[PDB]
Structure 1
Amino acid sequence: GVGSSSGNWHCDSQWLGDRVITTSTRTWALPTYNNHLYKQISNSTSGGSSNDNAYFGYSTPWGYFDFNRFHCHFSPRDWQRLINNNWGFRPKRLNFKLFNIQVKEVTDNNGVKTIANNLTSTVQVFTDSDYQLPYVLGSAHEGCLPPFPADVFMIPQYGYLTLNDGSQAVGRSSFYCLEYFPSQMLRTGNNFQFSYEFENVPFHSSYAHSQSLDRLMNPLIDQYLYYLSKTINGSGQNQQTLKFSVAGPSNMAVQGRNYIPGPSYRQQRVSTTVTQNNNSEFAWPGASSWALNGRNSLMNPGPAMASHKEGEDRFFPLSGSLIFGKQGTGRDNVDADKVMITNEEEIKTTNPVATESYGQVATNHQSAKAQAQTGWVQNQGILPGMVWQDRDVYLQGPIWAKIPHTDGNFHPSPLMGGFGMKHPPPQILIKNTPVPADPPTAFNKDKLNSFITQYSTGQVSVEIEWELQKENSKRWNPEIQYTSNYYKSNNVEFAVNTEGVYSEPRPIGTRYLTRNL
C-alpha cells in the first residue's frame, strides 16, 4: 500500500562465537540515465587517445548496486575488533533487500522547479544470477555504499566494454540489451529481496609472521650437510683446491633449506623525499608493464611483494601498492600529502622486496680461461617449493572479485586483495521505468522521444554473515594491536568535523596478530 512502510532500518553487528553478522542500511537516489537510451561509446566518442587507451563499448540506462568494500559493512570499531582478535575470516552468507521505493516527477517552468510524487510509476530490478552480463564489479570503482550510514548516495550508471580495434568494433563484439532479462517491477509499496551463499573460499590471513623464511633453523645445532667454502689454497698461481665445511649457526646464509620465497616482478623505487629522486619524468617510461594484443597496461598492483626493506619506509614501488585518496582530495595531479599509500611490509618474511632483484644465477662455466659469472634475476616465476603471502585487505578496499572464465588460472586470489570466486555475489541492476509525455493525436511509427522527468529514492539493506578463525597462540609477550592515540586533537579520528563531513584518516589493514611459519 501507499501508506504502509515496506521495511525497517536494520544496521548493526552481532558477534556470535565464531561468527559475525553485519547489517547495513543506506538511502539511495537513482536518476534517469542516458535519456532512457543505449549508446555506443569509444575513445572516438571520448575524443581520441593513444593506442594503449582505445576502447569500444556501450553505456546503458540502468544503474547498479555495489557493496564490494569492507567499510560498507564494518564500522571502524568492528574492524578493530576483528583484526585485533582473529587470525582469519571469510564471508559465508548474504541477504539483500530493497524497500520504501519513492518515485518523483520534476516539472521545470520558466523560473521554478516543482517536485511531486508519481504514485503509479515503477522501478525495475533484477539480479544477474546466471552471470550472463559483463561483470564490472571487481574493478575498484566508485559508487559503493558510503562508509557513514547517514550519507545518502547516488546509484552509479552501468556500462561495459567489448572487443575493439582502435575505436572500431569487430564481428566478435557483443551487444547486450538489459531489457532482454526478466525483472521485477515495483510501485511504491512493493519491495525486493534475495539471498546468496558464498562459495567455499580460504580464510584471509589477518596475521603477520613472527618468523622469517631464512631463519627457521635451530640456532644451536649444526647441520649434517656440508658446503663448499674454499676454492683456492691462497695467493699465487695453480692454487686450486676444494674445501668443505659444516653449515652451522655461525654461517646461516649457506645452510640447506626446504622452502624458498615466492615469485617476483621488479618495480621501480620512488622516494617520498623528492630530492632523492632523479630529476626526470619516469612515471610512465620507468614503469613495469605487460602487453596484450599490442596494448601496454601498467603492472598495477602486480604480484604481492614487500614494499621496502627494514628502515626504508620512505621508499615505495612505482605501481606496486594501493593508493587511496583522503577526504576532499581532487582527481588530477594532487600532492603526496593528499593521498594514502599502503605498504605490505608484513609479508617481508616470505615475499621478496618489490624493488629488488629476486637473486643471482650462474651465467657461464668457470674453467682454467673464464671466471665465474652471475646475473641478476629481475622476474622469477613460480618454482616448486616456493611459499608466499597474498596482499592484505583494508577497511577501504575491495572484498571479492570474479575469477575470469578461462581454461587455466593459478592461485586466483585477486591481485588488489580479497576473495576470488567463480560465482561471486551477482550484479543487481535497477532502472526507472520510462513514462512517456503526451503523444500526438495522429499515429507516428517512430519511437517516442519525449518523456516525463523522473527519479527515484529508497532504502537498501545488505546483511552478511562471516566466519571467523580464532587465535590460540602460545606467545608469552603481548602482541601488536591497532589502537587510537590518546593525544589531543581538533577532531576525532573516524568521525565528522564541524561541517558534517565524515573522513577516514588512514588505511587500516588486518595483520596485527602474529603466527609462526
Structure 2
Amino acid sequence: DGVGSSSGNWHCDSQWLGDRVITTSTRTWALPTYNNHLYKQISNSTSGGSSNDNAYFGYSTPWGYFDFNRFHCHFSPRDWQRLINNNWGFRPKRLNFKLFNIQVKEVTDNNGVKTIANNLTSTVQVFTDSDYQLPYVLGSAHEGCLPPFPADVFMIPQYGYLTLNDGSQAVGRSSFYCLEYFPSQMLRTGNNFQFSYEFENVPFHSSYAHSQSLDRLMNPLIDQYLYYLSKTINGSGQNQQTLKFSVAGPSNMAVQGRNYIPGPSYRQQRVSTTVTQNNNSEFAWPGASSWALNGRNSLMNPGPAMASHKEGEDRFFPLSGSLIFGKQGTGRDNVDADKVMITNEEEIKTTNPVATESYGQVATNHQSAQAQAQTGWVQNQGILPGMVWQDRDVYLQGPIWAKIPHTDGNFHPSPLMGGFGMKHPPPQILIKNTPVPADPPTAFNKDKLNSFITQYSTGQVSVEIEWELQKENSKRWNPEIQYTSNYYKSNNVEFAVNTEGVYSEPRPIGTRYLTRNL
C-alpha cells in the first residue's frame, strides 16, 4: 500500500500440534552494498596463494542471500530439548517465507561526518531460484546464518560461486551466471515478499540411539545350530592335525554367525586431546585422511558416519572426522582446544565401526603345510550386501539440508555433515538493493556510470517451517537417559545472555538421547 501502514506483523513462535511443529523465526536484517554494484572474478591469483590444492576460480556478485539452513535459527533450545526428548524422528514438510517492512537508507559523508537519512524512492529487488539454475551455495554450512537469539541484527552474506579451473586460469566450460536474468520482484518501502514451499519426501531423521548393539543380537540362553572350526591343532608336536567343530554358543559368543555386518569405515588418524600423548611431530596435514580428485588433495572432512572414541577412552577424537564448532567469541585462527567445542559421537557406537580403528582383519595367502596363515588389516571397506550403518547425528548448530548434486547416480545421499539430503532443497533467496547513480555529467559519455550513492536497506525476514514428527512408542521399563541443565550454581545461565549482552551457547547438543531396539 503506502509508507504509513505496516507491511507485516512480527511473528515468532513455536507451537506444538499433535504431531507437528510450526516454528516461525523472524529476525531483522541489514544488507550493505557489495562490490560497488560490480561482478568480479575471485581467482586466487587476485590474492596470493601458493598451492595447487587451494587453486580456485570464481565470480563475486553484489547479491546477498539468506542462509538459514542451520537449526539454531528455528529452535529455541528449550524447544529443542522438548523435541529430542519425546520424539524418535522428525521431518520438514512446508516452508513459508516472508520479507516485510523493507526500508532503504542513504549515507551522506560531508566532511569527517556521516548523515543517515531515509530514502523513500529507492528500491530493493529480491528473487528466488525455483528451478535451481544457479549454483547452490547453502550446502557447505557457511557462516552468516540467522543469529540464534532474535534480539541480534545481522549482515547478509555476499554471494559468489566457484567454477571449473586449472591453476588460477579458467577452462572454457567455466560458467558465468549473471544473476540478473531471473525475474525479481522490485520492492519499495511498503511492499512485502512471500512464497511457499513443499519439501519433497525425505526419510525421517532418526533421533533414537540403539538400545542393543549389533554384534550382540543373539539369545544368551540358547545355542545356535552351527559349527565354527574350533581347534585345528590336535596338540603340540609334528603332524598333529585335526578338524574339530563345536557349537557356537553363549560360552564363546563372538564366534556365532550373524545375519548382518556393521557399516563402512574409512580410517581417520587418532588425535588425543591430552597434550603429551600425541606425537611430537607435525602430522596435521601429512597424516590426515584425504580423498584426492583431479590432482587436488582434499581432506576427507566429515566422511562416513562412524563412532569416534572406543568406550571408556574419551581422551582422543579423530583428526578430521568429527564436526567441530567454536564457542561464542572464538578467535579466527590458531584457537586453543579449550575455546572450541569438539563434537563426540558415542550414540552410533553400536552399529558403526570406530573411526580410529580398523574395520576388521582379512586373510591373504592360502595356508599350506609349509606356509602359515597370514591376515592383513582392512583400512577401508566399501558397502557390502547386508551391511547396516547409521547416519551421523544432527546437531542443533549443524546444518539442515544439502542439495544432492544432480548426477547420473549417487548412493544413500545423506549429507556427510548431517541432516536431510534432497533433490530440490528450499530455494535460495537473493536480495540486492538496486544501484542509484550519483549525478551524471551533462555532456554525454559512452562509459557506464561508476559513481553510485552509498546505500543500504533494512527489514525483517520470517522463516516458517513445519516439522513433522514421530512419537516414542517404546515399552522400555527403566527410566530413560535424557537431557538436563547442570543444576549446581553457575555464574551465568547456560544458553542465556551474558552481562554485557553477548549471547553464548555453552556446549553442542546431540540429537540422540532416546533408546530404541535394533
Q: If the length of structure 1 is used for normalisation, what is the TM-score?
A: 1.00
* 1:161 positional shift: 0.3
* 1:46 positional shift: 1.8
- Is the 1:491–1:497 contact (alpha carbons within 8 Å) kept by the matching residues of 2? yes
Aligned to 1:425, what secondary structure does the other structure show?
A: coil
CA distance in 1: counterparts of 2:122 and 2:50, whole angstroms: 42
CA distance in 1: counterparts of 2:219 and 2:58, whole angstroms: 60
Aligned to 1:241, what secondary structure does the other structure show?
A: coil
* 1:4 positional shift: 1.1
Q: Deviations over 1:280-324 (max 9, x none)?
A: 000000000011110000001111100110111111000001100
CA distance in 1: counterparts of 2:404 and 2:47, whole angstroms: 29
Aligned to 1:444, what secondary structure does the other structure show?
A: coil
Q: Deviations over 1:400-429 (max 9, x none)?
A: 000001101000000000000000000000
CA distance in 1: counterparts of 2:181 and 2:347, whole angstroms: 48
* 1:232 positional shift: 1.1
Aligned to 1:464, what secondary structure does the other structure show?
A: strand
Aligned to 1:138, what secondary structure does the other structure show?
A: helix
Q: Which residue of the partner structure matches residue 60 of structure 1?
A: 61
Aligned to 1:250, what secondary structure does the other structure show?
A: coil
* 1:181 positional shift: 1.2
Q: Which residue of the partner structure matches residue 101 of structure 2?
A: 100
Aligned to 2:202, what secondary structure does the other structure show?
A: coil
* 1:179 positional shift: 1.1
* 1:486 positional shift: 1.1
* 1:66 positional shift: 1.1
* 1:109 positional shift: 1.0
CA distance in 1: counterparts of 2:182 and 2:228, whole angstroms: 68
CA distance in 2: counterparts of 1:463 and 1:190, whole angstroms: 19
Q: Which moved more, 1:44-53 or 1:258-267?
A: 44-53
Aligned to 2:180, what secondary structure does the other structure show?
A: helix
Q: Deviations over 1:461-488 (max 9, x none)?
A: 0100011000111110000110111110
* 1:27 positional shift: 0.5
- Is the 1:104–1:455 contact (alpha carbons within 8 Å) kept by the matching residues of 2? yes
- Is the 1:206–1:512 contact (alpha carbons within 8 Å) kept by the matching residues of 2? yes
Please tell me whether residue 208 in structure 1 is matched to residue 209 in structure 2. Answer: yes
* 1:57 positional shift: 0.5
* 1:48 positional shift: 2.4
CA distance in 1: counterparts of 2:51 and 2:211, whole angstroms: 47
Q: Which residue of the partner structure matches residue 443 of structure 1?
A: 444
Q: Which residue of the partner structure matches residue 170 of structure 1?
A: 171
Aligned to 1:180, what secondary structure does the other structure show?
A: coil
- Is the 1:43–1:49 contact (alpha carbons within 8 Å) kept by the matching residues of 2? no
Please tell me whether residue 91 in structure 1 is matched to residue 102 in structure 2. Answer: no
CA distance in 1: counterparts of 2:403 and 2:242, whole angstroms: 58
CA distance in 2: counterparts of 1:248 and 1:232, whole angstroms: 21
- Is the 1:392–1:511 contact (alpha carbons within 8 Å) kept by the matching residues of 2? yes
CA distance in 1: counterparts of 2:462 and 2:404, whole angstroms: 26
Aligned to 2:435, what secondary structure does the other structure show?
A: coil
CA RMSD of aligned residues (A): 0.6
Aligned to 1:81, what secondary structure does the other structure show?
A: helix
CA distance in 1: counterparts of 2:390 and 2:25, whole angstroms: 31
CA distance in 1: counterparts of 2:50 and 2:333, whole angstroms: 17
Where structure 2 has 5 or more consecutive residues not aligned to the other structure, the ranges are: none
* 1:274 positional shift: 1.0
Q: How many residues align?
A: 517
* 1:367 positional shift: 0.7
CA distance in 2: counterparts of 1:470 and 1:49, whole angstroms: 53
Q: Deviations over 1:87-138 (max 9, x none)?
A: 0001001000001011001000112110001101000100000000000001
Q: Deviations over 1:211-234 (max 9, x none)?
A: 011110110001111110011110
* 1:331 positional shift: 0.9
Q: Which residue of the partner structure matches residue 497 of structure 1?
A: 498
CA distance in 2: counterparts of 1:353 and 1:170, whole angstroms: 41
Aligned to 1:337, what secondary structure does the other structure show?
A: helix
CA distance in 1: counterparts of 2:50 and 2:63, whole angstroms: 27
- Is the 1:101–1:458 contact (alpha carbons within 8 Å) kept by the matching residues of 2? yes
Q: Which residue of the partner structure matches residue 232 of structure 1?
A: 233
Q: Deviations over 1:424-476 (max 9, x none)?
A: 00000000100001110111010001111100000110100011000111110
* 1:142 positional shift: 0.5
CA distance in 1: counterparts of 2:171 and 2:37, whole angstroms: 26
CA distance in 2: counterparts of 1:509 and 1:515, whole angstroms: 16
CA distance in 1: counterparts of 2:465 and 2:334, whole angstroms: 37
Aligned to 2:308, what secondary structure does the other structure show?
A: coil
CA distance in 2: counterparts of 1:81 and 1:167, whole angstroms: 50
- Is the 1:94–1:198 contact (alpha carbons within 8 Å) kept by the matching residues of 2? yes
CA distance in 2: counterparts of 1:381 and 1:15, whole angstroms: 42
Q: Deviations over 1:35-76 (max 9, x none)?
A: 000001111012122000000000001000111000110000
Aligned to 1:79, what secondary structure does the other structure show?
A: helix
- Is the 1:400–1:418 contact (alpha carbons within 8 Å) kept by the matching residues of 2? yes
Q: Deviations over 1:362-388 (max 9, x none)?
A: 100111110010010000000001101
CA distance in 2: counterparts of 1:5 and 1:412, whole angstroms: 43
Aligned to 1:123, what secondary structure does the other structure show?
A: strand
- Is the 1:208–1:514 contact (alpha carbons within 8 Å) kept by the matching residues of 2? yes
CA distance in 1: counterparts of 2:435 and 2:502, whole angstroms: 35
CA distance in 2: counterparts of 1:218 and 1:111, whole angstroms: 81
* 1:204 positional shift: 0.6
Q: If the length of structure 2 is used for normalisation, what is the TM-score?
A: 0.99
Aligned to 2:468, what secondary structure does the other structure show?
A: strand
Q: Which residue of the partner structure matches residue 33 of structure 2?
A: 32
What is the identity percentage for the equivalent residue pairs of Structure 1 and Structure 2? 100
Would you tell me which structure has more helix in proportion to its own residues? Answer: 1
Q: Which runs of 4+ in 1 moved over 6 A?
A: none
CA distance in 1: counterparts of 2:198 and 2:192, whole angstroms: 21
Aligned to 2:46, what secondary structure does the other structure show?
A: helix
Aligned to 1:78, what secondary structure does the other structure show?
A: helix
- Is the 1:124–1:430 contact (alpha carbons within 8 Å) kept by the matching residues of 2? yes
CA distance in 1: counterparts of 2:48 and 2:121, whole angstroms: 41
Q: Which residue of the partner structure matches residue 279 of structure 2?
A: 278
Aligned to 2:106, what secondary structure does the other structure show?
A: strand
Please tell me whether residue 78 in structure 1 is matched to residue 79 in structure 2. Answer: yes
CA distance in 1: counterparts of 2:192 and 2:19, whole angstroms: 32
Q: Which residue of the partner structure matches residue 310 of structure 2?
A: 309
CA distance in 2: counterparts of 1:392 and 1:371, whole angstroms: 43
- Is the 1:69–1:396 contact (alpha carbons within 8 Å) kept by the matching residues of 2? yes
CA distance in 1: counterparts of 2:175 and 2:498, whole angstroms: 48
Aligned to 2:309, what secondary structure does the other structure show?
A: coil
CA distance in 1: counterparts of 2:142 and 2:425, whole angstroms: 16
CA distance in 2: counterparts of 1:344 and 1:310, whole angstroms: 11
CA distance in 1: counterparts of 2:197 and 2:67, whole angstroms: 15
Q: Which moved more, 1:39-48 or 1:252-261?
A: 39-48
* 1:164 positional shift: 0.3
Aligned to 1:496, what secondary structure does the other structure show?
A: coil
- Is the 1:89–1:203 contact (alpha carbons within 8 Å) kept by the matching residues of 2? yes
- Is the 1:265–1:379 contact (alpha carbons within 8 Å) kept by the matching residues of 2? yes
Q: Which residue of the partner structure matches residue 288 of structure 1?
A: 289
Aligned to 1:83, what secondary structure does the other structure show?
A: helix
Q: Deviations over 1:331-367 (max 9, x none)?
A: 1001000100111111110000000110000100111
CA distance in 1: counterparts of 2:378 and 2:111, whole angstroms: 70
- Is the 1:96–1:463 contact (alpha carbons within 8 Å) kept by the matching residues of 2? yes
Please tell me whether residue 149 in structure 1 is matched to residue 131 in structure 2. Answer: no
CA distance in 2: counterparts of 1:242 and 1:178, whole angstroms: 73
CA distance in 2: counterparts of 1:395 and 1:502, whole angstroms: 16
Aligned to 1:189, what secondary structure does the other structure show?
A: coil
